[PDB]
């Protein structure tokens, strides 16, 4: 399948223990893809004062489409030194590894794979 129904849990930023997926664009997007089907992925919704607390290269997901049964669209964009390896709409939150935090919430996403 093009696309896979996902649910990810979201993450406060201070519970996070691994806060980011390597340390090249093509690392961190690879790791995230793996992490995303093997279900171990949490999502953290960015605010003020939350990206200088992880780690870059960061894994965003972005909005690819204006909703099939709640899951909204998404694609994954990558960022370096302030360079984006991709092109898509707004964010949704940047991603990270899931070793067993608990989260706030869940968001239900439609993965472009």
Avoid: N, W
Avoid at 19 to 30: H, N, P, Q
Avoid at 65 to 77: I, N, R, S, T
Avoid at 85 to 109: D, Q
Wanted: glycine share 10%; proline share 5%.
């Amino acid at each position: 399948k093009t696309h896979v129904q996902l649910s990810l849990p979201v993450l406060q930023v201070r519970d996070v223990l691994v806060r980011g997926f390597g340390d090249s664009v093509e690392e961190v997007l690879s790791e995230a893809r793996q992490h995303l089907k093997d279900g171990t992925c949490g999502l953290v919704e960015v605010e003020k004062g939350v990206l200088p607390q992880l780690e870059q290269p960061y894994v965003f997901i972005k909005r690819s489409d204006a909703a099939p049964h709640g899951h909204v669209m998404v694609e994954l964009v990558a960022e370096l030194e302030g360079i984006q390896y991709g092109r898509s709409g707004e964010t949704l939150g940047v991603l990270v590894p899931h070793v067993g935090e608990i989260p706030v919430a869940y968001r239900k996403v439609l993965l472009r794979k």
